[PDB]
């Protein structure tokens, strides 16, 4: 479903936005996940070209 | 604390509340210090205190930065350098040096 498929997103900064922040940050912080941007939502947060 | 004590009896004893200078004669010290002492004694207010609409507007969101410098000003600073630098090239090399020195 749309709300379920939107849950999985490679970029954690995007997920940290509309999902539960705590869980996203923790669950990402343990694995040492490296966000490469490459997406729209994340680039808007960091403030560079879409 | 001593001030609170007087304010307690005198609240109803006077029927209104003691005037800002009323507790002053009751207290030993120069008695104008009530204002100063009364101010520093206050506890600071939480910057997160919600005010109005219940909206995410919070007291801290309304506090402007006074230590910054507006660009409409900063622009005039960078220009004034070019200004005084231009007008100091219009004089003799010693007048420019002497004024740049002073």
């Amino acid at each position: 479903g749309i709300t379920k498929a939107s849950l999985a997103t490679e970029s954690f900064i995007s997920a940290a936005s509309f999902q539960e922040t705590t869980r996203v940050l923790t669950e990402a912080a343990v694995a040492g996940k490296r966000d490469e941007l490459r997406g729209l939502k994340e680039n808007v947060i960091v403030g560079r070209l879409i | 604390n001593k001030l609170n004590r007087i304010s307690r009896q005198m609240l109803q004893e006077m029927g209104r509340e003691p005037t800002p200078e009323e507790l002053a004669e009751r207290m030993l010290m120069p008695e104008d210090k009530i204002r100063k002492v009364l101010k520093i004694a206050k506890e600071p207010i939480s910057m997160e205190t919600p005010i109005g609409d219940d909206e995410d507007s919070h007291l801290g969101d309304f506090i402007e930065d006074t230590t910054l410098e507006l660009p409409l000003d900063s622009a005039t600073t960078e220009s004034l350098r070019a200004a005084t630098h231009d007008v100091l090239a219009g004089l003799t090399a010693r007048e420019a040096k002497v004024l740049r020195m002073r």
């Binding site: 808007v44 | 029927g15 969101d61 900063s74 622009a75």
Partner: protein, 1342 residues
């Protein structure tokens, strides 16, 4: 009755038939009545300050036998009156002085007092006071407390079918809601197990409370179940049979007794078999030993010999169990009567889920439910359970709760104890089970019989009660250790605790809000308002559509069409026209009692539940003569529905055709012709009309506007009738008639008029005299109009000539195209009064000066200021002008090399003081109408401030002197009259000095005692004047108390006059909005053959889609109205004679047949008639009753008298080309309002302003407004387009980048368009917040 004096000035032509049997009561009733009951001396427990005292009192100490009781209370005179309290900013309040009696019982009594000290009226708090208009002043601002609508206290039985468990089966739950104290909830489950929960807490098996009530299982079974008697007589099981018990069950064995077999096995027992048993009276039958295998034993049963328990109560017996209790000698065994249809075996199964056994256990399990985790104690469990529903302190249903409680349980007493009793809980459980059993029904929350209405008085009582409990703990705490005769009921009772409870309510509460005063209708429609929100109510997020929707019980009580459109719909509504709060607090409405076949004019108020069973006729119905219903059947409503009802059935009939709507909806003409959506919006927008410069009058109307003007305090109503002695634009003095005058003091009524002053909405509220020198006025007549009121009616705007036709697209959507004639006539102009302030505070760097010496300002700047630094009164100002000079210390400027060179060349000394002076906001321009200077006590008042103080002193003396002069003359003028009776000397008496009159006596009579009376009151006034003058002078000279740190404050009052410009919002009463687009010259205005242009051109396309047809009718009749005016305007310019005018005017007021208006020739044929005609020449005022209003034929008929076409359409010619317009266009007169959305408020623009400290973001600090907020949706909008750079600049350089912004600005002036964006400070801050935790966040690579 048969017509007043300001009615002779102007009369509104009233169509409509239905006679008004009852007239609109005081519309502010609730507000005034409520607070009137709150603060009052009531010698009993009726709600009021007395009751809240009598609850918590008397207060006795802890075991110490030291008691403090309450004697009586009083409200001291207000410290400041309403006006002074508003100017200064303090609260309008009275001191509460209450006599307390402290009794001390001798230690180790028999109770007797050592000494009892009565402390004379100890002061606790200052309680706010209500204005004569029903408003409060908290801090200098009029505020209204809206009446509240909540769930009535009592018992309520609900369903919760559907959603639960999705098996259907419904559920049945009961809820006991007290006025104060914990909630007691009962509810079923799918297994038919009765449950209980206190408040919202953990669910508990119902029976657990009964044990806590000290009920053993045996008495629980005995209470909720009947007894099935089993006899062992001879041997093997006989049984008692009540012949009705066999209904709903099938024979399980051979049923035989009395030597005759009534029913065999397998034959269901119907009413016929039951009849045989009933008529044959069969008490005892023989039953098998296996039938009790399922039957639950009622009481306990033990073996007489061994003394051992055979079976506990509520245990299922078996064939083996019967044997073990049989050999013990038991003849009788009691069992439960259980039927899965009629009487359910519920309670029995509830006990098997009950963890407790005895009272302490239940009390433990309850206490461990309420306060879990902590070890239970006997005294703790007992204390909790007794403190919840059984304590007079922590629990009350009050009167409404107890009444509805007892009433819903089919009890007798309508009034009773304010706590719960064991009988009550048990009875409530019985009713819930009875509903599950099929007898009885569930109520619904939306019904208006279960919805109770509070109001300021009731709410204030509750808050004062909270104050008394928090003071109670203290009083007991001190009386614990108290020394005998030293302390008194002063040292104990404080002020701040009580004062702060009540102050926290009126100051900030969801029900305490700024009165909406831009408009009389806005005020009066605010003061009648209901809310289901706020404390003790539901919330928008919480409650669904069930409570918001309109209910059949809303008829005559809540207005269906006046409610806000938005987040809360139907959560506000408004009070109806004739509605009144019921004696018990419900909503009841007026009705007419129909006895036999006659309609009686006795009025009867019926509440929501009272009205239910009666059959009520319709407001619109045809009866005649004796008032018998003409038709044999008429549309009526009886129980929740409407259908045709027979001639004599109806018990009652509606009083008026209006009573369904509210004051807002009742002011919309031809309302019956407008769709409900647009009508709502109309009555919603009608409250936003700003008053105008010239109060006009509505040309099309209803007839409530007259009543609304008077009932609202905007106008000045005659206290007593008489002739006006003096008329000024300032005051009005009326000489009283003797019949209306009281014997002593003689008198005259002096009305001091309000002049130009600031309203809550920053409009102008100014009164003008509507009466002329030496005119007779009768009691209850309008002396002076307020803002937006004309000659006693309510005018919220100005009617004008409007044409429906597309005009070159300038009217495109709702847009309005207005002729220049309107702005030139200055009719839609509005006067705004804004209050600007300048505060001189104290900083650690130094005190701030109001001095007029300001670094770097020219002579043109300092011109408009006096020597003291304050702008002169009356000086017209514009943007940039300095209202108050102010300068604050900032030391050691720390300049730079080139700034130092600059000062060196031009030789200027840069001041040690920085300029904080208050200057006029950008773009606003007006005239200064007043200045006030408040100063801290001990700082020297400057020059100007002293002038004002001296000025106010002299002005005060002049006013008081004026009072005394007119008053004394009025009294001596009566003495002159009494002396002339019994001893008349006319010319002789007025020669000698007036002061020496008091010596002359009279012959024995009451006239001698009357001179005595007038003497007494004269000297009183002489001294009352003196004391009043002193107080005023002291109030002037007293240094006003300011905030900490502020040394002095200067408030300047600017009066701006704004007219009309493109961007303003305009709408009619019919829900047709508009925003003026272009202001067109009179040259381009469409005109008719006569050459008269049209003021406004409306787009016709808005009329069909949004269905408001009244706006067209209002136009048509409007045109017709103007016609009758124009005609009169011609006959007045003809100066025909009184005869000719009278004829034509009479002709208009009849209009062809059957209306209720009546009319003249009782009126004086010359002076009174000619004045009326002069007021009608502008137009002929017409009254369209709400649902009783005029008809097409009448409008067309009035158009025949008008000389104007029936179609209401004429030919119009374009003022540009002069050629005709194809087709006729509708032209007429529509009433149109100017709302205050005005374009020069909404308009904002910002280039580079201040910035927020916490996050660097655009923020207005100067009232130069922060930029527009760019949201998530706008980002997506940029994302759909391919624009990356617009988006980057939007969220980086234009807002959040503390670097990029300045680097951009320098490039914008340099001529290089670029951005060197950097990283937004928001995200840069977010990094530190993440990094503030144990999370390391880095930016990798390169």
């Amino acid at each position: 009755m048969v017509y007043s004096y300001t009615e002779k000035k102007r009369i509104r032509k009233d169509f409509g038939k239905r006679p008004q049997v009852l007239d609109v009561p005081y519309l502010l009733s609730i507000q005034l009545d409520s607070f009137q009951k709150f603060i009052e001396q009531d010698p009993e427990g009726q709600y009021g300050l007395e009751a809240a005292f009598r609850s918590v009192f008397p207060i006795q100490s802890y075991s110490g036998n030291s008691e403090l009781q309450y004697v009586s209370y009083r409200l001291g005179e207000p410290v400041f009156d309403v006006q002074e309290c508003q100017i200064r900013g303090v609260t309008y309040s009275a001191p509460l002085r209450v006599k307390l009696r402290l009794v001390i019982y001798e230690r180790e009594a028999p109770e007797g007092t050592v000494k009892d000290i009565k402390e004379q009226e100890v002061y606790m708090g200052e309680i706010p006071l209500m204005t004569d208009n029903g408003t409060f002043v908290i801090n200098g601002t009029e505020r209204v407390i809206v009446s509240q609508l909540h769930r009535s206290p009592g018992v309520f039985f609900d369903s919760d079918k559907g959603k639960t468990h999705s098996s259907g089966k419904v559920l049945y739950n009961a809820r006991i809601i007290p006025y104060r104290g914990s909630w007691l909830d009962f509810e079923f489950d799918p297994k038919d197990n009765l449950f209980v929960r206190i408040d919202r807490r953990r669910k508990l098996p119902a029976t657990i409370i009964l044990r806590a009530l000290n009920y053993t299982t045996e008495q629980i079974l005995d209470l909720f179940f009947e007894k099935v008697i089993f006899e062992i007589r001879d041997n093997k099981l006989q049984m008692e049979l009540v012949p009705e018990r066999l209904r709903g069950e099938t024979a399980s064995f051979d049923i035989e007794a009395n030597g005759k077999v009534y029913v065999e096995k397998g034959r269901r027992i119907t009413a016929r078999h039951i009849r045989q048993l009933e008529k044959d009276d069969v008490k005892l039958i023989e039953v098998p030993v296996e039938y009790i295998a399922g039957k639950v034993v009622a009481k306990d049963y033990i073996d007489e010999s061994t003394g051992e328990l055979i079976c506990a109560a509520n245990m299922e017996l078996s064939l083996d169990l019967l044997a073990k209790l049989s050999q013990s000698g038991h003849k009788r065994i009691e069992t439960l009567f259980t039927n899965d249809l009629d009487h359910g075996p519920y309670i029995s199964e509830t006990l098997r889920v009950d963890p407790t056994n005895d009272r302490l256990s239940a009390l433990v399990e309850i206490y461990r439910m309420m306060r879990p985790g902590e070890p239970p104690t006997r005294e703790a469990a007992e204390s909790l359970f007794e403190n919840l529903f059984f304590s007079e302190d922590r629990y009350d249903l009050s009167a409404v709760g107890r009444m509805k409680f007892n009433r819903s349980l089919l009890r007798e007493e309508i009034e009773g104890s304010g706590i719960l009793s064991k009988d009550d809980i048990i009875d409530v459980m019985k009713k819930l089970i009875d509903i599950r059993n099929g007898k009885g029904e569930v109520d619904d929350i939306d019904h208006l019989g279960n919805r109770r209405i509070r109001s300021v008085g009731e709410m204030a009582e509750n808050q004062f009660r909270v104050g008394l409990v928090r003071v109670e703990r203290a009083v007991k705490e001190r009386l614990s250790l108290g020394d005998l005769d030293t302390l008194m009921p002063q040292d104990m009772i404080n002020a701040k605790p009580i004062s702060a409870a009540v102050k926290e309510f009126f100051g900030s509460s969801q029900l305490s809000q700024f009165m909406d005063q831009n408009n009389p209708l806005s005020e009066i429609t605010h003061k009648r308002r209901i809310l289901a929100l706020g404390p003790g109510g539901l919330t928008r997020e919480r409650a669904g559509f069930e409570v918001r929707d309109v209910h059949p019980t809303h008829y005559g009580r809540v207005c269906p069409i006046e409610t806000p459109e938005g987040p809360n719909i139907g959560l506000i509504n408004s009070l109806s026209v004739y509605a009144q709060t019921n004696e018990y607090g419900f909503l009841e409405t007026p009705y007419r009692k129909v006895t036999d076949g006659v309609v009686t004019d006795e009025i009867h108020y019926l509440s929501a539940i009272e009205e239910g069973n009666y059959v009520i006729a319709q407001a619109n119905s045809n009866l005649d003569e004796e008032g018998h219903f003409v038709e044999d059947l008429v549309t009526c409503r009886s129980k929740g529905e409407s259908s045709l009802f027979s001639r004599d059935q109806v018990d009652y009939m509606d009083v008026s055709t209006q009573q369904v709507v509210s004051v807002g909806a009742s002011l919309i003409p031809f309302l019956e012709h407008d769709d409900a959506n647009r009508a709502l919006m109309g009555a919603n927008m009608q409250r936003q009309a700003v008053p105008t410069l010239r109060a006009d009058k509505p040309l099309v109307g209803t007839g409530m506007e007259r009543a609304v003007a008077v009932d609202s305090g905007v106008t000045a109503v005659a206290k007593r009738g008489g002739v006006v002695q003096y008329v000024d634009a300032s005051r009005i003095v009326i000489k009283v008639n003797e019949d209306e005058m009281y014997p002593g003091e003689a008198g005259i009524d002096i009305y001091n008029l309000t002049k130009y002053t600031r309203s809550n909405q920053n409009t102008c509220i100014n009164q003008m005299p509507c009466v002329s020198l030496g005119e007779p006025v009768e009691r209850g007549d309008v002396l002076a109009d307020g803002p937006s009121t004309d000659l006693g009616e309510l005018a919220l705007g100005q009617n004008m000539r409007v044409a429906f036709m597309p005009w070159n697209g300038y009217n495109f959507e709702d847009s309005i195209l207005v002729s220049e004639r309107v702005v030139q006539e200055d009719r839609f102009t509005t006067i705004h009064i804004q209050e600007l302030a300048c505060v001189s505070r104290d900083t650690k760097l130094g005190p701030e000066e109001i001095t007029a010496d300001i670094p770097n300002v020219g002579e043109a700047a300092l011109s408009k200021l006096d020597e003291s630094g304050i702008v002169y009164i009356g000086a017209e100002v514009t943007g940039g002008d300095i209202l108050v000079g102010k300068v604050t210390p900032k030391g050691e400027t720390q300049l730079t090399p080139e700034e130092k060179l600059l000062r060196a060349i031009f030789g200027e000394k840069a001041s040690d003081v920085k300029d904080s002076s208050l200057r006029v906001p950008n773009g606003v321009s007006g005239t200064v109408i007043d200045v006030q200077v408040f100063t801290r006590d001990g700082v020297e008042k400057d020059k100007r401030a002293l002038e004002i103080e001296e000025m106010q002193l002299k002005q005060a003396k002049k006013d008081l002197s004026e009072e005394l002069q007119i008053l004394e003359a009025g009294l001596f003028s009566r003495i002159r009259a009494v002396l002339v009776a019994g001893g008349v000397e006319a010319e002789k008496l007025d020669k000698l000095p007036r002061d020496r009159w008091l010596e002359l006596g009279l012959t024995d009579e009451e006239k001698q005692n009357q001179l005595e009376q007038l003497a007494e009151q004269y000297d009183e006034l002489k001294h009352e004047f003196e004391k009043k003058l002193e107080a005023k002078r002291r109030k002037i000279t007293q240094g006003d108390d300011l905030a900490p740190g502020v040394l002095k404050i200067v408030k300047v009052y600017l009066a701006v006059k704004r007219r009309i410009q493109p961007g303003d919002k305009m709408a009619g009463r019919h829900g047709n909005k508009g925003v003026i687009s272009k202001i067109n010259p009179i040259e381009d205005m469409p005109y008719d053959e006569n050459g008269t242009p049209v003021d406004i051109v409306l787009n016709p396309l808005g009329v069909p889609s949004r269905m408001n047809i009244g706006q067209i009718l209002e136009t048509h009749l409007g045109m017709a109205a103007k016609g009758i005016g124009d005609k009169i305007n011609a006959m007045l310019k003809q100066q025909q004679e009184v005869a000719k005018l009278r004829e034509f005017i009479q002709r208009a007021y009849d209009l062809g047949a059957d209306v209720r208006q009546k009319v003249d020739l009782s009126t004086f044929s010359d002076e009174e008639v000619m004045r009326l005609a002069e007021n009608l020449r502008k137009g002929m005022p017409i009254a369209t009753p709400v649902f009783d209003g005029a008809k097409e034929a009448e409008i067309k008929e009035l158009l025949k008298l008008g000389d104007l076409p029936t179609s209401g359409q004429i030919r119009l010619y374009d003022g540009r080309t002069g050629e005709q317009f194809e087709r006729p266009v509708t032209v007429g007169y529509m009433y149109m309002l100017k709302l205050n959305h005005l374009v020069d408020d909404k308009m904002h623009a910002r280039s580079t302003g201040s910035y927020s400290l916490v996050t660097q973001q655009p923020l207005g600090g100067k009232a130069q407004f922060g930029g527009q907020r760019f949201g998530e949706m706008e980002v997506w909008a940029l994302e759909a387009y391919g624009a990356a750079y617009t988006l980057q600049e939007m969220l980086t350089v234009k807002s959040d980048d503390v670097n990029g912004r300045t680097k951009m600005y320098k490039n914008i002036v340099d001529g290089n368009h670029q951005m060197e964006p950097g990283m937004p400070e928001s995200f840069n801050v977010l990094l530190k917040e993440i990094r503030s935790l144990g999370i390391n966040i880095e930016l990798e690579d390169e």
